[PDB]
Design a protein around this ligand. Structure first.
Ligand SMILES: O=C1c2ccccc2N[C@@H](c2ccccc2F)N1c1ccccc1
Ligand SMILES: O=C1c2ccccc2N[C@@H](c2ccccc2F)N1c1ccccc1
Length: 148
């Protein structure tokens, strides 16, 4: 049990994802929204998203979260997995987080390559999100996607 380990757990303990939504970055229109804390490690979350999203050049994400702990460099590593193989990857940086703050994080997400159809993908995709303060691994969460 290292000091780094202990810190990560404290950051996790104080971390909460409050709400999120996703939008076509052209229409600016809602594809998905929720208040389920999809960041929660150790369970497979499920999420229903519209087949239409696969057709988007890019997706805009708004994400609201709280943190009792201060973070130097708060960032995510995300991966699409399809039947256990990684198709795509992203790195996003929020940076500095003030202790006891609530914050709304806007990102833009681009698809790199050709999409298999929804019917093939549905229930076979997992999105893995790793939450880091700099080099420190705080949490790893998984979401399975059904396309509807
Ligand atoms: O950014 C997120 C996200 C953020 C916090 C926690 C889990 C996340 N997983 C996915 C995501 C977002 C919205 C709905 C389902 C979903 F799996 N996700 C996402 C959306 C698009 C591309 C990659 C990851
Ligand atoms: O399901 C996918 C997806 C499926 C196969 C290959 C890459 C994927 N990445 C994202 C996604 C889809 C469409 C446009 C951008 C994008 F990042 N994506 C997605 C959609 C909703 C929420 C999170 C990720």
């Amino acid at each position: 049990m290292s000091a780094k380990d202990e810190r990560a757990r404290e950051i996790l303990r104080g971390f909460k994802l409050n709400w999120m939504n996703l939008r076509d970055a052209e229409t600016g229109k809602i594809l998905w929204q929720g208040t389920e804390d999809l960041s929660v490690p150790g369970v497979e979350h499920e999420a229903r998203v519209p087949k239409k999203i696969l057709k988007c050049k890019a997706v805009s994400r708004e994400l609201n979260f709280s943190s009792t702990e201060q973070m130097e460099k708060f960032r995510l590593e995300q991966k699409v997995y399809f039947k256990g193989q990684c198709l795509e990857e992203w790195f996003f940086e929020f940076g500095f987080v003030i202790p006891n703050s609530t914050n709304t994080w806007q990102s833009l997400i681009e698809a790199a390559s050709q999409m298999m159809p929804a019917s093939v993908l549905t229930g076979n995709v997992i999105i893995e999100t790793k939450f880091f303060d700099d080099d420190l691994l705080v949490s790893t969460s998984r979401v399975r996607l059904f396309y509807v």
